[PDB]
CSV table of C-alpha atoms and ligand atoms in Angstrom, one decimal:
chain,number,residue,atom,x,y,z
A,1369,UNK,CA,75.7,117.9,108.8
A,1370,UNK,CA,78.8,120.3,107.4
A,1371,UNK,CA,79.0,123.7,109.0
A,1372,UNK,CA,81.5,125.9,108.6
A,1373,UNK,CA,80.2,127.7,111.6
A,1374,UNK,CA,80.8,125.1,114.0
A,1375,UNK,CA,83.3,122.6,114.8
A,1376,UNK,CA,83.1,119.3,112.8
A,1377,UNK,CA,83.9,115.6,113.9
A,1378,UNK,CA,86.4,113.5,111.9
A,1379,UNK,CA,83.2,111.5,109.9
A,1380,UNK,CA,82.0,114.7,109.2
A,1381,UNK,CA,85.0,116.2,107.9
A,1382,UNK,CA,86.3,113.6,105.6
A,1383,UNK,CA,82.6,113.0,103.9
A,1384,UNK,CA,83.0,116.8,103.5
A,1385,UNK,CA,86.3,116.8,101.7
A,1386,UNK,CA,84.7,114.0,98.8
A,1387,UNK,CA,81.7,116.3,99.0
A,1388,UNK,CA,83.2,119.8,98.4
A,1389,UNK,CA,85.5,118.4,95.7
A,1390,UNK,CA,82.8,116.3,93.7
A,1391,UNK,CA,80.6,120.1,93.6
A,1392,UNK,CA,83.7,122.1,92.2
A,1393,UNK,CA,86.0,119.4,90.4
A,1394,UNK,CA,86.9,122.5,88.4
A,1395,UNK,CA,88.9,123.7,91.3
A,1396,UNK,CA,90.0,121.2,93.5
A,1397,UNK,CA,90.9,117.3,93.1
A,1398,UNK,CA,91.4,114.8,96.3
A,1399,UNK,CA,94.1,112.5,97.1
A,1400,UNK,CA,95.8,111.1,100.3
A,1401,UNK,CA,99.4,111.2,100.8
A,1402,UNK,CA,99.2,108.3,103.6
A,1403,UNK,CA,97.4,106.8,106.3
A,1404,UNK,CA,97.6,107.1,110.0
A,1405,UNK,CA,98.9,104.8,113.2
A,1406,UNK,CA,94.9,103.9,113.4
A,1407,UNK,CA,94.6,103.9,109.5
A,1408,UNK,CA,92.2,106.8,109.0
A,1409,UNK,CA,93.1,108.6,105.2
A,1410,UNK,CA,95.6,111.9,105.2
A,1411,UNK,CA,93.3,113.7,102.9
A,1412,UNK,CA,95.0,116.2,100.8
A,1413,UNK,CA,92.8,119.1,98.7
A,1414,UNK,CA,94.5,120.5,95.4
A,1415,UNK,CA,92.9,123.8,95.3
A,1416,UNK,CA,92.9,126.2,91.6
A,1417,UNK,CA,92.4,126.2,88.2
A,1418,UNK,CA,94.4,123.3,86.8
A,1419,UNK,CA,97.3,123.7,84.3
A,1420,UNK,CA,101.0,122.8,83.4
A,1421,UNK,CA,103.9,123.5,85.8
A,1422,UNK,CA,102.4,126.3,88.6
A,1423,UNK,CA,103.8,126.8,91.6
A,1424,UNK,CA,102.1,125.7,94.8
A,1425,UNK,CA,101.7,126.6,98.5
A,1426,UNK,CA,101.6,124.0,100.9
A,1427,UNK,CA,99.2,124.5,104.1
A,1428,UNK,CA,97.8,122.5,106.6
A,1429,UNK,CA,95.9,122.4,109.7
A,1430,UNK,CA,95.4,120.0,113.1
A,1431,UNK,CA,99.0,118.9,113.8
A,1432,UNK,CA,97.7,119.6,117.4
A,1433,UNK,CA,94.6,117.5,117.9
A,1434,UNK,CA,93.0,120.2,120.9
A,1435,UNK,CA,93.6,123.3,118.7
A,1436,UNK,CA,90.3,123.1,116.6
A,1437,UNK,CA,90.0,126.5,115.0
A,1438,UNK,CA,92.7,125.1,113.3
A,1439,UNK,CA,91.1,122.0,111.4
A,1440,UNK,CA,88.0,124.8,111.0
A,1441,UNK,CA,90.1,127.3,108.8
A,1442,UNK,CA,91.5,124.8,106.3
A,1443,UNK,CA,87.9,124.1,105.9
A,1444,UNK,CA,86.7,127.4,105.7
A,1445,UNK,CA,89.5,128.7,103.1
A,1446,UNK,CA,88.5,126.0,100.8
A,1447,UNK,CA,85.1,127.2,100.7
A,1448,UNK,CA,86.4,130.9,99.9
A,1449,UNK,CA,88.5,129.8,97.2
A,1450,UNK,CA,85.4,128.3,95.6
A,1451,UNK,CA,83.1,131.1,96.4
A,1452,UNK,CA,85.1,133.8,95.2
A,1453,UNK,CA,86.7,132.4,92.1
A,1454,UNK,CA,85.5,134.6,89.4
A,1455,UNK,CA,84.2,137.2,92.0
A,1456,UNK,CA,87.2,138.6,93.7
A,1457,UNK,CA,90.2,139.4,91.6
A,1458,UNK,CA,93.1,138.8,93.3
A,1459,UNK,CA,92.0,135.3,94.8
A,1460,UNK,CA,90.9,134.3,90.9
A,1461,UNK,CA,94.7,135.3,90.1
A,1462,UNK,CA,96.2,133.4,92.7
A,1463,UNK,CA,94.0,130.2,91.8
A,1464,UNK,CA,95.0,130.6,88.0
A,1465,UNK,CA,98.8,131.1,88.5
A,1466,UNK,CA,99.1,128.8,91.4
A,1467,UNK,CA,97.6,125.8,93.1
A,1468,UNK,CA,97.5,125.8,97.4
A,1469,UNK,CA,98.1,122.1,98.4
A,1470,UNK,CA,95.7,122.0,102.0
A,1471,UNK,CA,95.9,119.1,104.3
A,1472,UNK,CA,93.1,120.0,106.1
A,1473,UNK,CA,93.8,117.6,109.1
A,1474,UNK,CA,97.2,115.8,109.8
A,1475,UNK,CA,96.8,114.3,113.1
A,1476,UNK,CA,93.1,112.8,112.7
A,1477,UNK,CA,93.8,109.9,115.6
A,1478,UNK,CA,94.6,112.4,117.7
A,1479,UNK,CA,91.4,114.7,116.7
A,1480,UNK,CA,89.0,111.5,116.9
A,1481,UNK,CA,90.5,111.5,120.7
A,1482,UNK,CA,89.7,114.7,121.1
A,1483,UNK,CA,86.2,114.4,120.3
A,1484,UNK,CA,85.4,110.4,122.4
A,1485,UNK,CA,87.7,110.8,125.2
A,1486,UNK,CA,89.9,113.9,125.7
A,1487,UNK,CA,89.4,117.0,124.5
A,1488,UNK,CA,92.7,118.3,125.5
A,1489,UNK,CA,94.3,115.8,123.9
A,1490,UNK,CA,97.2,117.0,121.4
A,1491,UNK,CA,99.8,114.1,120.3
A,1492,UNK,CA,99.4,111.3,118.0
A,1493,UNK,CA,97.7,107.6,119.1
A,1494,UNK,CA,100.4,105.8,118.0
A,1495,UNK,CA,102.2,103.3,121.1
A,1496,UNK,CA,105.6,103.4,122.6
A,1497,UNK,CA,107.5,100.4,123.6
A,1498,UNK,CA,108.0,100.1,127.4
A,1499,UNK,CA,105.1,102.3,128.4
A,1500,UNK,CA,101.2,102.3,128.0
A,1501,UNK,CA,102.0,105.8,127.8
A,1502,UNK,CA,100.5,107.2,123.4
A,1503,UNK,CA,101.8,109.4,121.6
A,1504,UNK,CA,104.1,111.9,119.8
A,1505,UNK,CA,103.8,115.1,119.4
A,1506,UNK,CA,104.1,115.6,115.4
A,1507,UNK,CA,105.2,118.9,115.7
A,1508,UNK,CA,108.5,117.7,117.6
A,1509,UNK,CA,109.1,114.7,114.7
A,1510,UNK,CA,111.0,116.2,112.1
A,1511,UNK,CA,114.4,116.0,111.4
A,1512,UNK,CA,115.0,119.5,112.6
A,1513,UNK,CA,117.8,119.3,115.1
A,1514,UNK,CA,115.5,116.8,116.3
A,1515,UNK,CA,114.8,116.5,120.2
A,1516,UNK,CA,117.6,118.6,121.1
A,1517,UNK,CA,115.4,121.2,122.7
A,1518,UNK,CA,112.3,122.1,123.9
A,1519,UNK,CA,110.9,118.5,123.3
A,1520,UNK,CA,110.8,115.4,125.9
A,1521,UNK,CA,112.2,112.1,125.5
A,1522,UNK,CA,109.5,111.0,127.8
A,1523,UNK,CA,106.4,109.3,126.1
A,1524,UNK,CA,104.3,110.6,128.7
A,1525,UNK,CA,105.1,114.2,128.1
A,1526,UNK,CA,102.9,116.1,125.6
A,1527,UNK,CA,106.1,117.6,123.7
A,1528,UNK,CA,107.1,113.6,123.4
A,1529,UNK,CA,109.5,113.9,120.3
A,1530,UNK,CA,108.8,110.2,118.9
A,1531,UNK,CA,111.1,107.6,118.7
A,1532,UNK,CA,113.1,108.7,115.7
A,1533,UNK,CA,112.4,111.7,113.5
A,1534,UNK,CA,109.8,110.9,111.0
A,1535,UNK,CA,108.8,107.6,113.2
A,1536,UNK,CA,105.1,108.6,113.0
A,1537,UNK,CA,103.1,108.1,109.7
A,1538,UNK,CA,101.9,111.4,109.5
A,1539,UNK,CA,104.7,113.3,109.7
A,1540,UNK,CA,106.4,110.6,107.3
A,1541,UNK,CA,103.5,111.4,105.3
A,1542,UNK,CA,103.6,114.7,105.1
A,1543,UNK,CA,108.0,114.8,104.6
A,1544,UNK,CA,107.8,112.7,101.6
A,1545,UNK,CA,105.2,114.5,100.2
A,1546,UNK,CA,107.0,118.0,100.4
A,1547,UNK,CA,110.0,115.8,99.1
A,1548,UNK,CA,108.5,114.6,96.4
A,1549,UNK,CA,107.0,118.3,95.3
A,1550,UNK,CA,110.2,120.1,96.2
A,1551,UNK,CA,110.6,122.1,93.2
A,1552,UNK,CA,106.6,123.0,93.0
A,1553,UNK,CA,105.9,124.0,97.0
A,1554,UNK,CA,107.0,127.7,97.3
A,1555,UNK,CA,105.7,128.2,100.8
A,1556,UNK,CA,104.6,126.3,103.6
A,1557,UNK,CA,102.4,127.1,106.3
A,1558,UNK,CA,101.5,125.4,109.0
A,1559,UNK,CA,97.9,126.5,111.3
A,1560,UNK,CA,97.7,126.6,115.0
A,1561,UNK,CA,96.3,127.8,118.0
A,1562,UNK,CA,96.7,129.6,120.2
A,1563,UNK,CA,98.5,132.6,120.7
A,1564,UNK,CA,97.7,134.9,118.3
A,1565,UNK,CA,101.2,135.3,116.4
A,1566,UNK,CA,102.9,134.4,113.4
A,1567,UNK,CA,106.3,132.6,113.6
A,1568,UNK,CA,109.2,131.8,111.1
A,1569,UNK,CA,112.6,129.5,111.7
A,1570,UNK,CA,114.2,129.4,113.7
A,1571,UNK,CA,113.2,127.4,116.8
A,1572,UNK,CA,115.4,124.2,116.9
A,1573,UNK,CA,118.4,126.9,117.5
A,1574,UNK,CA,118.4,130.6,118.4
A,1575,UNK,CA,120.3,131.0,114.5
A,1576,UNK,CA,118.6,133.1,111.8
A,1577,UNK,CA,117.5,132.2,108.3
A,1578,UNK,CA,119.4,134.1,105.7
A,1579,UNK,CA,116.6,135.4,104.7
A,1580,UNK,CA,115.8,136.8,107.9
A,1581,UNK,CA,115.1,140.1,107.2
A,1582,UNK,CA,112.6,139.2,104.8
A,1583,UNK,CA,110.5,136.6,106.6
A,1584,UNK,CA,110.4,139.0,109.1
A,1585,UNK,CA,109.2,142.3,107.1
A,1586,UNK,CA,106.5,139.4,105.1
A,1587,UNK,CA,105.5,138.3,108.4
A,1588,UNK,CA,105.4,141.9,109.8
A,1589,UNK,CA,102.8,143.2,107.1
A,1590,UNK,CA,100.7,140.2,107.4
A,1591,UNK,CA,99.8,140.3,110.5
A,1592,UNK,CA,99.0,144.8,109.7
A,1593,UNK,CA,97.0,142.7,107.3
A,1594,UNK,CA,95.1,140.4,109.2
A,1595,UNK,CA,94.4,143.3,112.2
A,1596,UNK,CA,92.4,145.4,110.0
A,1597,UNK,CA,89.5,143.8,110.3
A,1598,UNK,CA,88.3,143.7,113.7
A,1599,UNK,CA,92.0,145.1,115.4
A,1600,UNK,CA,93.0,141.7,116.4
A,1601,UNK,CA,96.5,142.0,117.5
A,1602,UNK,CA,99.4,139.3,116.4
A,1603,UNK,CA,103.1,139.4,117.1
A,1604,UNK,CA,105.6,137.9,115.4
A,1605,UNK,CA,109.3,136.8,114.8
A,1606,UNK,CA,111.9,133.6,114.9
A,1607,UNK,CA,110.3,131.0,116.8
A,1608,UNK,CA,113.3,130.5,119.1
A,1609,UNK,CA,113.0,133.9,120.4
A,1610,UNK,CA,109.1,135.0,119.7
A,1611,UNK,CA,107.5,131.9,122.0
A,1612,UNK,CA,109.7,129.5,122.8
A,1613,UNK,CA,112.8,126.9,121.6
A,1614,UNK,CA,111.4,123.9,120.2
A,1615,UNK,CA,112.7,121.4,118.3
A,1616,UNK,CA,111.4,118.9,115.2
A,1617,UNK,CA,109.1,121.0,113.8
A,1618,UNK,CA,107.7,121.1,110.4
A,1619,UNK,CA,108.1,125.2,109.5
A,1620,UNK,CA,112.2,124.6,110.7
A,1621,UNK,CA,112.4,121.2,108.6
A,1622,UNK,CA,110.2,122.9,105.1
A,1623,UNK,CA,113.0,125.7,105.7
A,1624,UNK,CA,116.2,123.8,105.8
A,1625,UNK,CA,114.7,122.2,103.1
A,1626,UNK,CA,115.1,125.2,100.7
A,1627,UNK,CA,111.4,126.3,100.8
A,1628,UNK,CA,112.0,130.1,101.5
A,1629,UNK,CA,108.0,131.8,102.8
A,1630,UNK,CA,107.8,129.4,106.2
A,1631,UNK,CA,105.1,130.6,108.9
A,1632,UNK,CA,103.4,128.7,111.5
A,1633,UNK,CA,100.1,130.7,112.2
A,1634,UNK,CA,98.7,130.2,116.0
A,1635,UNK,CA,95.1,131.8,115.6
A,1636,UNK,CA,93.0,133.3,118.4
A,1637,UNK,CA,92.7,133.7,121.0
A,1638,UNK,CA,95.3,134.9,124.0
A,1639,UNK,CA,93.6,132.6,126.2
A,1640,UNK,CA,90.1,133.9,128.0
A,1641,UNK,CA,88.9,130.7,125.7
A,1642,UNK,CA,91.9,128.8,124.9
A,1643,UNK,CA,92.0,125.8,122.8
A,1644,UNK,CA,88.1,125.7,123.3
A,1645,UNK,CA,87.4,128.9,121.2
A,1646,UNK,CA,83.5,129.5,121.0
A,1647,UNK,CA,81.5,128.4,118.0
A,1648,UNK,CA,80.5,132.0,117.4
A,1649,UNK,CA,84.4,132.9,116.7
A,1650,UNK,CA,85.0,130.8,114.4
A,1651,UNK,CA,83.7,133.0,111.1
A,1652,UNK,CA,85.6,136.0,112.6
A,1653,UNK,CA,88.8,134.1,113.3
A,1654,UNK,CA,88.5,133.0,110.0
A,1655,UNK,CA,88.4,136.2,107.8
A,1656,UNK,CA,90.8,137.4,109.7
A,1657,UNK,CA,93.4,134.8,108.9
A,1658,UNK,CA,92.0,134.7,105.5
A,1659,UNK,CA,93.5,137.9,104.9
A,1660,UNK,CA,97.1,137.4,106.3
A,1661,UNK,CA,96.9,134.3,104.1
A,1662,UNK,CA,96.2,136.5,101.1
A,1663,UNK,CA,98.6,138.7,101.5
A,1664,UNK,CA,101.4,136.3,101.9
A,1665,UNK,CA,100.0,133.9,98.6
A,1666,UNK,CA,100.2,137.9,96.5
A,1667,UNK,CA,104.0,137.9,97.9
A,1668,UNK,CA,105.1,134.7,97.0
A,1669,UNK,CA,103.8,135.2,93.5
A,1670,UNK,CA,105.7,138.3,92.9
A,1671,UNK,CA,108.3,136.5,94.4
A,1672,UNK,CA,109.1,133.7,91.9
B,1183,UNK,CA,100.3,125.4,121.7
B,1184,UNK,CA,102.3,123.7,125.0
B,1185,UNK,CA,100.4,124.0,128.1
B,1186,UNK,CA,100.9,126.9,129.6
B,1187,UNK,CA,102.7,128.9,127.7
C,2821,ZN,ZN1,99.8,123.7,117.9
């Protein structure tokens, strides 16, 4: 069954998103806003109290199919939302003034994969013409000075940046979804692993966002946040120059596209574990995080 | 996430 302890399959995960919304349809309603290459349902959770014209945040989790702590905090901030609704003050204000969208997995092909055949497996499934080589890497297929750096042209290479920007259904998917909720979405964040930092635009181009100085104090005070816990240590800054160039990702693209608050998290740990963080992590990863996330949902609602 | 950095 559902743990939010331990790491859970694809079947397990999607019976858990009709499960979790049909015990608090008060707080969060189910759609999809597309299907994969192999035709497996881009779940998308509405979390908060429902009502005319709030603001959202956008966050979701498993772009990279290896990086499962990912997939398990979507799960697990869903489940704090509903347990401390009514309890703790300052989530019940942030899930009556605003709603977070969570996408708890985007690349689900690639996670299946992960869990039948290769665990370190990180594209999409999707095939390329003139190779038997699969795959794009989603977080290299947005229309974000796309494939210009940092990305391969190669199908066979993990950072393969598709055939065209947006040529993958999921990250089609997900770009006409923050399209189409444009003047709603006030942040975006994006969950990875690992690395331990927290990263804003730019890394298709070593230019800064106007608003530089900002996403960099925000980001800053997060990650004080997120270290008070149990003294886990981030870093943080412009892609470009924090990790490495890359182009075609989804923070850069949400950006450019006039959302202001754009992070891409990379959770624990430095790599002693890797992409194959124990089990016994996961809650401590997790409330962790949960706090950076806080903080940054308080800022963007004084920031409206 | 890209292998190894
Ligand atoms: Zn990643």
């Amino acid at each position: 069954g559902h743990s939010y302890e331990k790491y859970n399959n694809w079947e397990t995960i999607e019976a858990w998103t009709k499960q979790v919304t049909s015990e608090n349809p008060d707080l969060i309603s189910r759609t999809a806003i597309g299907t994969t290459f192999l035709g497996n349902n881009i779940y998308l959770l509405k979390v908060g109290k429902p009502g005319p014209n709030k603001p959202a945040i956008f966050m979701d989790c498993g772009f990279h199919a290896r990086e499962w702590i990912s997939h398990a905090f979507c799960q697990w901030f869903v489940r704090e939302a509903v347990l401390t609704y009514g309890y703790e003050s300052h989530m019940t204000e942030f899930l009556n003034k605003l709603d977070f969208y969570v996408l708890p997995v985007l690349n689900i092909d690639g996670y299946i994969y992960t869990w039948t055949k290769n665990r370190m497996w990180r594209k999409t499934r999707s095939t390329n013409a003139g190779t038997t080589c699969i795959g794009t890497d989603p977080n290299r297929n947005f229309d974000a000075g796309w494939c210009t750096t940092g990305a391969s042209t190669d199908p066979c290479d993990e950072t393969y940046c598709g055939s065209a920007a947006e040529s993958e259904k999921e990250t089609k998917a997900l770009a006409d979804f923050i399209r189409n909720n444009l003047s709603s979405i006030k942040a975006y964040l994006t969950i990875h692993s690992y690395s331990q930092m927290i990263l804003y635009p730019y890394s298709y181009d070593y230019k800064l966002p106007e608003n530089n100085a900002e996403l960099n104090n925000l980001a800053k005070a997060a990650v004080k946040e997120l270290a008070t816990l149990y003294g886990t240590k981030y870093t943080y800054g412009p892609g470009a120059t924090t990790i490495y160039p890359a182009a075609g990702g989804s923070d850069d693209w949400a950006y450019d596209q006039g959302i202001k608050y754009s992070f891409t998290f990379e959770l624990r740990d430095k790599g002693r574990y890797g992409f194959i963080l124990p089990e016994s992590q996961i809650q401590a990863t997790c409330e962790e995080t949960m706090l950076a996330i806080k903080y940054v949902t308080n800022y963007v609602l004084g920031h409206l | 996430x890209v292998y190894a950095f």
